[PDB]
Structure formats: C-alpha cells, structure tokens
Design an enzyme around this catalytic site. Structure first.
Site, PDB file in Angstrom:
ATOM      1  N   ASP A  81      30.014   6.914  13.426  1.00 14.88           N
ATOM      2  CA  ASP A  81      30.512   5.868  12.738  1.00 14.88           C
ATOM      3  C   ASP A  81      31.833   5.529  13.419  1.00 14.88           C
ATOM      4  O   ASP A  81      32.616   6.235  14.049  1.00 14.88           O
ATOM      5  CB  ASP A  81      30.761   6.254  11.412  1.00 14.88           C
ATOM      6  CG  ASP A  81      30.963   4.969  10.491  1.00 14.88           C
ATOM      7  OD1 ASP A  81      31.763   4.477  10.604  1.00 14.88           O
ATOM      8  OD2 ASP A  81      30.093   4.957   9.256  1.00 14.88           O
TER       9      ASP A  81
ATOM     10  N   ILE B 107      27.876   2.938  18.072  1.00 15.34           N
ATOM     11  CA  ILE B 107      26.613   3.038  18.698  1.00 15.34           C
ATOM     12  C   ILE B 107      26.483   2.173  19.785  1.00 15.34           C
ATOM     13  O   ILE B 107      25.780   2.401  20.630  1.00 15.34           O
ATOM     14  CB  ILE B 107      25.389   3.206  17.472  1.00 15.34           C
ATOM     15  CG1 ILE B 107      24.336   3.878  18.154  1.00 15.34           C
ATOM     16  CG2 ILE B 107      25.067   1.540  17.113  1.00 15.34           C
ATOM     17  CD1 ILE B 107      24.417   5.403  18.599  1.00 15.34           C
TER      18      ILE B 107
ATOM     19  N   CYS C 259      30.359 -31.419   8.606  1.00 13.57           N
ATOM     20  CA  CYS C 259      30.834 -32.407   7.929  1.00 13.57           C
ATOM     21  C   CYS C 259      31.275 -32.520   6.661  1.00 13.57           C
ATOM     22  O   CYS C 259      31.764 -33.050   5.585  1.00 13.57           O
ATOM     23  CB  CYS C 259      29.965 -34.056   8.465  1.00 13.57           C
TER      24      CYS C 259
HETATM   25  N1  LIG Z   1      26.580   0.777   3.843  1.00 18.23           N
HETATM   26  S1  LIG Z   1      27.965   1.188   4.200  1.00 18.23           S
HETATM   27  O1  LIG Z   1      28.816   0.206   4.471  1.00 18.23           O
HETATM   28  O2  LIG Z   1      28.497   1.903   2.899  1.00 18.23           O
HETATM   29  O3  LIG Z   1      28.128   2.223   5.363  1.00 18.23           O
HETATM   30  C1  LIG Z   1      27.636   1.913   6.682  1.00 18.23           C
HETATM   31  C2  LIG Z   1      28.458   2.579   7.768  1.00 18.23           C
HETATM   32  C3  LIG Z   1      27.864   1.892   9.309  1.00 18.23           C
HETATM   33  C4  LIG Z   1      29.175   1.711  10.141  1.00 18.23           C
HETATM   34  N2  LIG Z   1      28.999   0.850  11.209  1.00 18.23           N
HETATM   35  C5  LIG Z   1      28.634   1.516  12.625  1.00 18.23           C
HETATM   36  N3  LIG Z   1      28.803   2.712  12.919  1.00 18.23           N
HETATM   37  C6  LIG Z   1      28.379   3.290  14.024  1.00 18.23           C
HETATM   38  N4  LIG Z   1      28.329   2.139  15.089  1.00 18.23           N
HETATM   39  C7  LIG Z   1      28.277   0.824  14.876  1.00 18.23           C
HETATM   40  C8  LIG Z   1      28.599   0.547  13.687  1.00 18.23           C
HETATM   41  C9  LIG Z   1      28.496  -1.087  13.561  1.00 18.23           C
HETATM   42  O4  LIG Z   1      28.143  -1.241  12.178  1.00 18.23           O
HETATM   43  C10 LIG Z   1      28.858  -2.183  14.487  1.00 18.23           C
HETATM   44  C11 LIG Z   1      30.107  -1.861  15.463  1.00 18.23           C
HETATM   45  C12 LIG Z   1      30.031  -3.153  16.132  1.00 18.23           C
HETATM   46  C13 LIG Z   1      30.978  -3.623  17.440  1.00 18.23           C
HETATM   47  C14 LIG Z   1      29.775  -4.517  17.981  1.00 18.23           C
HETATM   48  O5  LIG Z   1      30.753  -2.388  17.848  1.00 18.23           O
HETATM   49  C15 LIG Z   1      31.907  -3.904  16.614  1.00 18.23           C
HETATM   50  C16 LIG Z   1      31.903  -5.297  15.961  1.00 18.23           C
HETATM   51  C17 LIG Z   1      32.852  -5.544  15.167  1.00 18.23           C
HETATM   52  C18 LIG Z   1      33.922  -4.823  15.122  1.00 18.23           C
HETATM   53  C19 LIG Z   1      33.962  -3.597  15.818  1.00 18.23           C
HETATM   54 BR1  LIG Z   1      35.382  -2.108  15.536  1.00 18.23          BR
HETATM   55  N5  LIG Z   1      32.798  -3.108  16.538  1.00 18.23           N
HETATM   56  C20 LIG Z   1      29.121  -3.923  15.641  1.00 18.23           C
HETATM   57  S2  LIG Z   1      28.351  -3.513  14.191  1.00 18.23           S
HETATM   58  C21 LIG Z   1      30.123   1.498   9.119  1.00 18.23           C
HETATM   59  O6  LIG Z   1      31.530   1.826   9.624  1.00 18.23           O
HETATM   60  C22 LIG Z   1      29.833   1.867   7.815  1.00 18.23           C
HETATM   61  O7  LIG Z   1      30.744   3.029   7.613  1.00 18.23           O
END
Ligand SMILES: *NS(=O)(=O)OC[C@H]1C[C@@H](Nc2ncncc2C(=O)c2cc([C@](C)(O)c3cccc(Br)n3)cs2)[C@H](O)[C@@H]1O
Ligand SMILES: [Zn+2]
Lengths: 500, 62, 311
Positions: A41, A89, A163
C-alpha cells in the site's frame, strides 16, 4: 484438508491494498493459516480510516498502512511471515517475475486504474486473481484466471461540457467542478481542459446558425491578491458573461458580486451553511495560505488539505450564489469535490471473508465452484442476500486479454498533439503505465524512458485515417494495436473517441 | 409481458416488452433472471419468463 | 452536533452513509455480547468500531489448547485465561470512545435484572435452552435479541426485534416490522399444506441448524475436528432422529454434510459476524429494514439466504 492446508502453509500470496478490505483480508488470511503474505500500500494512515481499518489506532496516524498492518498482526500471531511494502503496485519493480512468486493475488483497491494494471500483471504471470470491491452497504467478489474466465476488462465499465461549467451552470456540482478547475488554474498543473474564464465561442450564444455550427499568469502578476482575484472572478467575469445576450433570454441571468459590497452586508460544524460574507472571507483567507504553501513546495488538490478544501468550498459557494442557487455546507462539498465513498466496517468484513473462501476453492483445484458473489442490502426475489453467479469465459473481443488485441480511435490528426496521445489516450483511456508507441511503417513515437518530448500535431509524423500504432507496455507485458480514423466533426468537447 | 427490473438500491421499474432483451436493459449494469445472466439476444420465451429481473453494479471502493 | 469534533472526524465515512442522527442513536446504545469465540470476536470488533456507547463481553470459559493458535483479540499463549478477559485489551483499543466491559459469570446464572441495562443482547455458542430463556427475558423488557453461530463452512444469524419501527429512504418514511419469539422460529410445524409448500423453498441450512443445536444440547459442546470420526457418527444419527421427528426426509440434509460443519473457519466468522453486527447497528439506529428473522450462510456455495420462519 491436508492438500489444501499444505498449499496454504506452503505458497506465498499478495494482497494489493491495506485499507478497509485489505486489513480485514490480512487478518482472515493469517487466521486461516496462510503462512506467507506480501502486502503493499502506498498510503499513510488518516483519522477517517479508523472506523473500519481496525489494525490501525489513533496513535498510528501518519505511519504506513502496510507496515502498521503487519506490526498489528504480529501482536496476535508472532509467527506470521508478512512482507510489507510501503509502495505503489504500479512501481516497475513489481514486474512479471515479482508476480510469478505468488500462488494467489488478491486486490483490495479503491480505483479502476490500479485494478486494470493488476489485471494485466496477473494475466502476464498466469497467477489467479481475486478481484473485489465495496461501497456503502454493497460489494462483490470474483475470480480471474487466464484462459478460464473473463478478465477484469472483458466488459465495458461505467463528465461535464466545458460550456455548462464556464457559462451556464445550473447544478451545485457545476460550481464545485468550476472551483476545482479554478484551484488547478491558480496553483496546480495548468490544463487547457480546465479553463475557468467565460467561453467566448459557445454555440448557445451565437445568433447566426453558421457560427453556431462551427488565468495563472494574471494571478501571478497581482501577487495572488485575494481582492483582485475576487473581483476578476466574481465581478468582472460575470459582467462579461452577461455580454452573451443569447444565453440569458431563457434562463436567470447571474448577478455579479462586489467585494466591498459583500464585506458590508444543527448538525456538525461542517454541515452548517454560512453566509456570503463568510465564504468571501474564507476565499481570501485560503488564498493567502495557499500562496504561502506554493512558495515552500505546483500544488495538487487534496480534499484533506484544509486550505485546498476551504478554497474549493468558498469559490463554489460564491459561484452558486451568483447563479441564484442555495449554497452548500463544507461537509456536502467535501463529498462531491472529493468523490468520497461512504464506507463502514461490516461490508468490508463480509467481502474479505468471501475473498478467502474463493481463494481456498482456487488453491483446492475447485475453480469450477468459484463464483461472482454480489452482496445486496436487501434479499433478491429468491431470498438471496449474497447472490452467487457462475464465472463467464474470456470475451473473444476483449481489448486486453485476447490473442492479438486491436482497437480503433477516431480523432482529428491535425489538432491532436503527441502528448494528448500519451496522456488522454494511451495512459488514461487504455491504462498503460510505462508505454511505448511506434507507427506501423517498416518510427518510434513515444518512449518509456523520458527522450521524446514531439509533445507537435499527429499528422506531422505520417499519421492519417488508416495508420496503425503498436503500443507496448513491457511491464504489463501487453501489446495493443491502435488503428486511427480521422474526423473533424467530433464535438466542442469530444477530443477523441474509441470507436464502437 | 410486463416485467420488473429491480436494482440493488431497491429501484423498482415496471417495463413492458414482447416475448420474442437488449432493448429492455436501457453499460454500468449486469442483468439476472433467477440466477442466470441475461444475454443481449435472450428472449423471455427462451428463459421461461412470465417476472423480476435483478440488476447489479460492480462497486470500486475498498 | 451532539458528538465531539474528534468523533465526527473518526466516524466521518459512516456518518456519510447512515447520517448523524443514526450515529447518535448508536452512541446512546449498550450491547451485551455472549461468547468471545471466532464469531463473537468479529461481532465485538464491528460494534466497537461502529461506536456503540458500551459493549459488555461475557464469557465464562477459558481459552483452551484446542482453540485456534491465532485469534485476533487474544495474545498467543493465553491458554487458561478467561476468554473475555483475554479479549479486553485489544477490543477496547479498537475504539477508546466505547465503554468495553468484561463479565466472567455464566449467562445461565444471570438474573433477569442483569439484561435490563442493555439495548440489544447477542448470543453466540449458547444452548437452545439458553437461547429460548434469554429471548423470553428480552421480549418481557422490549430488548432487541440476536443469536448466531458458525459451524465449518456454514453460519446463521437470528433476530427477534419484537414490533420494530424504523425509517428508510424512499425522504424518509417510517415503517414497522413484526418478529416472532425464537421458540416459534425453532419449532416450525411442517404438517400443513402451507408448511409443506414453504418447505420446498426453505434452505436445508435451517435443518442443519436444528441438527447442530441438538448436538450442542446432547454433548455440551460443538463438533470438533479433533473428534471428527466420533462426532460425525453422532451427527448422522441426530440428522435421522431430528428430521424423522419433523416428518421430513432425513435425506434433505445430504449424508456428507458432516464434512462441512466442523470448527470455526475465520472467513465464515467474518461473513456471519459482519451480517450480524450490521443487523444490530440497523436495529439500534432504527434505520433500514432488518432481516426477518434468519440469515443462513453456506461458504461452499457462496449463498446467503434470509428466511422468515416461525409464524
Ligand atoms: N478501499 S480503501 O480506501 O479503504 O482502501 C484501499 C487501499 C488501496 C491503496 N492504493 C494502492 N495501494 C497500492 N498500490 C497502488 C495503490 C493505488 O491505488 C494507486 C497508486 C497510483 C499511482 C499511479 O501509483 C499514484 C497515483 C496518484 C497518487 C499516487 Br501517491 N500514486 C494510482 S492508484 C490505498 O492507499 C488504500 O489504502
Ligand atoms: Zn479480457
């Protein structure tokens, strides 16, 4: 049973996300006997997490979700082997070989883009993936297995005209979106699609049917002066808007606001709607803070930054006022601007329990007995609160998991840049993370390693209605052929279209 | 036939269609009859439809 | 409003689902939970996170050697400690706003006055005799009554909320739902033509429950995987006797059901505990229709069924 227990104690599993689903799922996996888990995460713990992310306490606010989740689990089961990654990830370190480590991947994500990426990684690595989601009282689980089931993208998945935002807003959301656009124009990445000034070329304005058929700089030059911004935005612009006489034949004209004029006028605190003066004051206050912050560290809008949130609240409520709509509480505007999904512990607990039950059937070689399971709020006509459905086979036409996939995109090859192709189309629409585009002609167009920067119209490369591109994502081990059609009758606001 | 579509949020609609289904379901939903997914080219006749169609959206939180 | 700023920040994502008034109702409510095994721990965790005023966790038993090596509220190595006492530190720490208390005395021995301090009572791992007794006490004093249990891949919840009024968004509208005593719910007469037609569409999980309740009455414990062969044999005999006794084919419960009804499987605790805790929340907050009156979960099939049985 012996075979299953050995598989579970044996192999290694991946949980992507340590939030609502992820914490529940981590617990259930450990108590079920999964002896090797990796958890990833990217985020840190927030106080709003604490109603449902039960491995985290108030004292942990600001630490890594993944690292705390592991520490908490080890306190009730010290022998667990858990690897925590404070990371995304989407990081290229998590390549096909990384995924091949695992007998099972489980998503615990809160957005489609990351789920799309994970889908591709699991297809590449040929590792089964359990996909899941929740929102409020509802949720679902399903199993994805290359060559057996539909993939996450086999089916099409479920937007404001410029618009209506710039000239003719009629709902609070239009004003909220306008304020978000305004924040980005002032302090964020200047995007052309997020223009806030009145639109001088709007079909509803034009009197003859021949023409109908057809910000940061300035705020910088004032020192980001609140009063000057207020007047330009809430006075000068509205009067200019009132120029466009056609617009206001039908509907209520907006009423411009004057700074000095305004200045001389239960549930939670945040659920109260304040008066115009107070929002005008909030607007001023928030700008003075943001300008200060924009000197230490362009800014990215975040619902959880008090100043960014106050800015959007005040700006949207003044615009609402101007267009004769009731203003909205900071609490309501936080929902809408932040797109907050209401969430509780029990829904995530049920979904996480189902995830592990699906996992056990997979690793037990009983995938024929895996199901898509929907969690309802109320029983269906057959009295079913949890509704299982058999898994469907891969979609032969899927743009992702089919043999040699191809899509078709209609745009205007003379007005569309090579950056819009990288960003609005290949990155955003087709969810590649590390893309490489090149023309199908015996001509590298986009490079993974940032090279290029092009970022030039498309027609200036030998691209016309009939050219073909070969988009790779080597990380996603995924290749997509894009066929171009050309057109000039797309629309005021439609810059490209995936042809169906 | 008069048919009822019912969504998760208890949104009840009375449709009215002929027994010879793509037009009924009128892409963020999936459609079920007593357990079984409803294809575009399904007909009431083909499915033993007198009744109620259930609709399901995929949630994206977590 | 009627909650502090810290509470509003903590409960934010659920206030956005069920509203501040519902949260204030939870905040006023005190719940008794009996039995701190796998299912009880899930229910405790969900109710404590939801922000009830108080939870009293009552269990008179010790952690035993046969209990799981991992239990999320109990530190490893607590064999011999009272189970509620062993659960208290981790449970309290999930939500300091909640008054979490422990009671170590046997529920059977409790006076009728012990129950009156609670807005809802939830029984896990109790005998049929105990379920009927406490449901009767709850009906006297208008206390919301729940029971549930997990057995292998299967689990169930039951509610008796008497005459239950609530609001539901169509604007809110006020509605009423009427429940029956658990004694009636457990002793349905399958003789009438009506009953015989109902039976066609009744989940066999309801007869499974009758078999497992009678095992618990006969043995003083639930089936255990350590005594699988011994317990399987007796369960088959009980199937015969229970179903024969109700005029139903014994073969309604398939012969190999014994493979799937042993022990506490953690994911089954999570599902059944999530459903049960959310019914408690709904009942306490008087918001949304509560399931009338049984929820049956089969984790092999992914089925979760709500049956109205008793009237
Ligand atoms: N349903 S919840 O909100 O209670 O918990 C969800 C959990 C998912 C986690 N997100 C996450 N974890 C690991 N790897 C990737 C993610 C992503 O969702 C993303 C990472 C990105 C990018 C492209 O890596 C990014 C975009 C914008 C800002 C940042 Br910093 N990085 C896109 S989606 C959440 O943290 C939550 O704990
Ligand atoms: Zn696919």
């Amino acid at each position: 049973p012996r075979e299953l227990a050995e598989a579970v104690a044996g192999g290694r599993v991946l949980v992507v996300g340590a939030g609502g689903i992820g914490c529940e799922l981590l617990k259930n996996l450990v108590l079920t006997g999964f002896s090797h888990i990796d958890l990833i995460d990217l985020d840190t713990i927030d106080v709003s997490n604490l109603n449902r992310q039960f491995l985290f306490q108030k004292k942990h606010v600001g630490r890594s979700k993944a690292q705390v989740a592991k520490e908490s689990v080890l306190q009730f089961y010290p022998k667990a082997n858990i690897v925590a990654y404070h990371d995304s990830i989407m990081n290229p370190d998590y390549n096909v070989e990384f995924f091949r480590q695992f007998i099972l991947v489980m998503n615990a994500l809160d957005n489609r883009a990351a789920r799309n990426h994970v889908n591709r990684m699991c297809l590449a690595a040929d590792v089964p993936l359990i996909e899941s989601g929740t929102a409020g009282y509802l949720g679902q689980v399903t199993t994805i297995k290359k060559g057996v089931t539909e993939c996450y993208e086999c089916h099409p998945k479920p937007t404001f005209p410029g618009c209506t935002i710039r000239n003719t807003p009629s709902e609070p959301i239009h004003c909220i979106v306008w304020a978000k656009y305004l924040f980005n124009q002032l302090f964020g990445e200047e995007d052309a699609d997020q223009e806030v000034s009145p639109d001088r070329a709007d079909p509803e304005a034009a009197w003859e049917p021949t023409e109908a058929e057809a910000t940061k700089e300035w705020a910088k030059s004032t020192g980001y002066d609140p009063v000057k911004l207020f007047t330009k935005l809430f006075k000068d612009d509205i009067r200019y808007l009132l120029t466009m006489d056609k617009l206001w034949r039908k509907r209520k004209p907006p009423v411009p606001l004057d700074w000095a004029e305004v200045q001389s006028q239960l549930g939670l605190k945040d659920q109260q709607v304040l008066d115009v003066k107070s929002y005008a004051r909030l607007f001023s206050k928030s700008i003075e803070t943001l300008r200060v912050h924009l000197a230490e560290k362009e800014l990215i809008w975040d619902k959880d930054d008090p100043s960014a949130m106050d800015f959007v609240t005040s700006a949207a409520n003044l615009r609402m006022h101007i267009f004769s709509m009731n203003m909205k509480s900071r609490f309501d505007i936080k929902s809408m601007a932040g797109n907050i999904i209401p969430a509780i512990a029990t829904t995530n607990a049920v979904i996480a329990g189902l995830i592990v039950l699906e996992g056990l059937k997979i690793l037990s070689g009983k995938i024929d007995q895996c199901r898509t399971i929907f969690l309802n709020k109320q029983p269906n006509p057959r009295k079913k609160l949890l509704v299982p459905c058999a898994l469907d086979p891969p979609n032969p036409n899927c743009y992702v998991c089919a043999s040699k996939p191809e899509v078709t995109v209609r745009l205007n090859v003379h007005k569309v840049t090579v950056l819009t192709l990288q960003d609005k189309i290949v990155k955003e629409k087709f969810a590649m993370v590390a893309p490489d585009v090149q023309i199908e002609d015996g001509t590298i167009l986009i490079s993974s390693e940032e090279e290029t920067e092009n970022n030039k119209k498309l027609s200036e490369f030998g691209i016309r209605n009939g050219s073909r591109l070969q988009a790779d994502d080597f990380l996603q081990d995924y290749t997509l052929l894009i066929n171009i059609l050309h057109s000039e009758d797309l629309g005021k606001d439609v810059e490209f279209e995936v042809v169906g | 036939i008069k048919l009822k579509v019912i969504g998760q949020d208890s949104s009840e609609i009375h449709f009215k269609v002929k027994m010879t289904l793509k037009k009924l379901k009128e892409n963020s939903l999936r459609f079920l009859f007593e357990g079984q997914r409803i294809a575009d080219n399904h007909t009431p006749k083909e499915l033993g439809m007198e009744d109620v169609i259930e609709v399901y959206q995929e949630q994206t939180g977590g | 409003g009627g909650i502090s700023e810290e509470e509003a920040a903590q409960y934010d994502r659920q206030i956005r689902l069920w509203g501040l008034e519902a949260q204030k109702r939870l905040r006023a409510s005190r719940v008794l939970l009996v039995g701190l095994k796998g299912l009880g721990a899930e229910i405790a965790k969900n109710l404590i996170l939801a922000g009830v005023k108080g939870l009293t966790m009552l269990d008179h038993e010790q952690v035993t050697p046969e209990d799981p090596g991992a239990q999320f509220l109990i530190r490893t190595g607590s064999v011999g400690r009272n189970r509620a006492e062993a659960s208290l530190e981790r449970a309290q720490n999930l939500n300091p706003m909640v008054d979490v208390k422990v009671d170590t005395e046997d529920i059977e021995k409790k006076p009728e006055s012990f129950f009156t301090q609670f807005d809802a009572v939830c029984l896990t791992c109790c005998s049929r005799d105990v379920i009927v007794k406490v449901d009767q006490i709850c009906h006297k004093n208008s206390i919301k009554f729940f029971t549930g249990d997990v057995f292998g891949y299967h689990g169930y919840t039951f509610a008796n909320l008497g005459e239950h009024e609530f609001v539901e968004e169509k604007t809110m509208v006020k509605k009423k739902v009427v429940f029956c005593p658990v004694k009636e719910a457990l002793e349905v007469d399958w003789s009438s033509e009506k009953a015989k037609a109902a039976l066609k569409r009744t989940t066999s999980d309801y007869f499974l429950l009758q078999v497992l309740l009678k095992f618990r009455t006969d043995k003083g414990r639930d089936p255990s995987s350590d005594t699988y062969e011994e317990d399987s044999e007796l369960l088959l005999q009980i199937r015969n006797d229970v179903l024969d006794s109700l005029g139903i084919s014994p073969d309604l419960l398939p012969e190999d059901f014994v493979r799937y009804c042993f022990s506490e499987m953690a994911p089954v605790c999570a599902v059944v505990g999530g459903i049960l805790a959310q019914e408690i929340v709904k009942a306490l907050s008087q918001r949304d229709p509560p399931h009338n009156n049984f929820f049956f979960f089969d984790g092999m099939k992914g089925n979760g069924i709500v049956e109205c049985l008793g009237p």
